[PDB]
Amino acid sequence: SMKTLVHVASVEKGRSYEDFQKVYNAIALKLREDDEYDNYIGYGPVLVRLAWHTSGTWDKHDNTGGSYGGTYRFKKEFNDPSNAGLQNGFKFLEPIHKEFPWISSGDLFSLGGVTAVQEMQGPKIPWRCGRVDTPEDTTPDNGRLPDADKDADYVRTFFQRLNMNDREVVALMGAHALGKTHLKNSGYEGPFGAANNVFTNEFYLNLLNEDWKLEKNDANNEQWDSKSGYMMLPTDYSLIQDPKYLSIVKEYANDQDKFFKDFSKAFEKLLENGITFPKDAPSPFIFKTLEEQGL
Ligand code: HEM
Numbered sequence: 001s002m003k004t005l006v007h008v009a010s011v012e013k014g015r016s017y018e019d020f021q022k023v024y025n026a027i028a029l030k031l032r033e034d035d036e037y038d039n040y041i042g043y044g045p046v047l048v049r050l051a052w053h054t055s056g057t058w059d060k061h062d063n064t065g066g067s068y069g070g071t072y073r074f075k076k077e078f079n080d081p082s083n084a085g086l087q088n089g090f091k092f093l094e095p096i097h098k099e100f101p102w103i104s105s106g107d108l109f110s111l112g113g114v115t116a117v118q119e120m121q122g123p124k125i126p127w128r129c130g131r132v133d134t135p136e137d138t139t140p141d142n143g144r145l146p147d148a149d150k151d152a153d154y155v156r157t158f159f160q161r162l163n164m165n166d167r168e169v170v171a172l173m174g175a176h177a178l179g180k181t182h183l184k185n186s187g188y189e190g191p192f193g194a195a196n197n198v199f200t201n202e203f204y205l206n207l208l209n210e211d212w213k214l215e216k217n218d219a220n221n222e223q224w225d226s227k228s229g230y231m232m233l234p235t236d237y238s239l240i241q242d243p244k245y246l247s248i249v250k251e252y253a254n255d256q257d258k259f260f261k262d263f264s265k266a267f268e269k270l271l272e273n274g275i276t277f278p279k280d281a282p283s284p285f286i287f288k289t290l291e292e293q294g295l
Pocket residue numbers: 045046048049052084085146147148155172173175176178179180181182183185186187188233235267
């Protein structure tokens with residue numbers, strides 16, 4: 001591999017907590033307003049998916065990809081087959097960026113995910129500013145995001161590239177409490193769980209408690225379906241097939257607070273992988289929800 005690239009965080013000129021809380025608020029207000037999307041699930045889940053896809057390209061071996069450069073705005077990454085459907089999240093963020101043109105693309109994509117998690121009643125995610133747009137030729141090639149038709153050994157190896165351990169993997173996957181698979185996007189179809197747009201630990205409870213059947217969907221792909229009408233990907237279900245993952249699933253199924261704390265740590269880490277924060281950078285921001293502000 002090549003010598004690691006160095007990506008030093010640089011605060012948008014003159015900006016501070018209050019500026020980023022205003023961007024958060026605009027995202028949160030649009031989440032509330034544009035609530036018809038995807039049969040009234042709203043844009044929360046796709047924004048969290050967008051944050052994972054734009055951060056999940058990172059390669060610890062050469063520090064390519066990751067959230068820093070905001071490269072999803074370029075054709076090669078925008079048109080990654082793995083990114084099908086994310087254009088809806090990008091379009092959601094367009095008026096936000098128009099109102100706050102000074103925020104970097106990487107800061108906006110990652111802050112979109114933080115805002116969505118918190119506004120869906122998830123844990124506070126501390127968030128740092130200072131990602132800087134990088135040129136088109138820094139865009140990572142397609143193929144760095146994970147396949148869903150795979151087992152636990154694949155999941156474990158894949159996430160080593162993001163410097164995630166077993167606990168971080170199981171915690172991050174809890175985001176599949178949110179939203180659904182869409183046959184036209186991914187070859188999988190159905191809601192993951194019951195609430196769809198409230199962040200809870202129901203991913204782990206459903207894995208353990210539902211009666212899952214391995215079925216074939218209308219795209220001829222196998223997926224796990226329950227009589228409650230939920231589905232899980234093969235990679236999701238692998239978390240109760242592998243004995244080490246299963247232990248952690250049981251822990252989170254039995255401790256909502258522990259899941260929230262571990263998810264918040266692993267999600268912040270995901271959004272910050274590859275970034276060098278200078279010694280005198282601002283501390284991470286913890287944004288108030290609209291509810292906490294009375295807005
Ligand atoms: C092995 C790892 C993962 C695999 C294979 C995977 C795969 C998928 C697939 C196939 C979909 C359906 C997309 C569609 O049809 O619209 C999806 C949706 C989603 N993913 Fe994952 N994912 C993984 C990890 C993650 C992580 C780590 C996060 C966030 C921390 C995340 C957040 C989401 C969300 C919120 C959705 C719902 C999107 C929507 O409703 O539009 N995923 N994932």
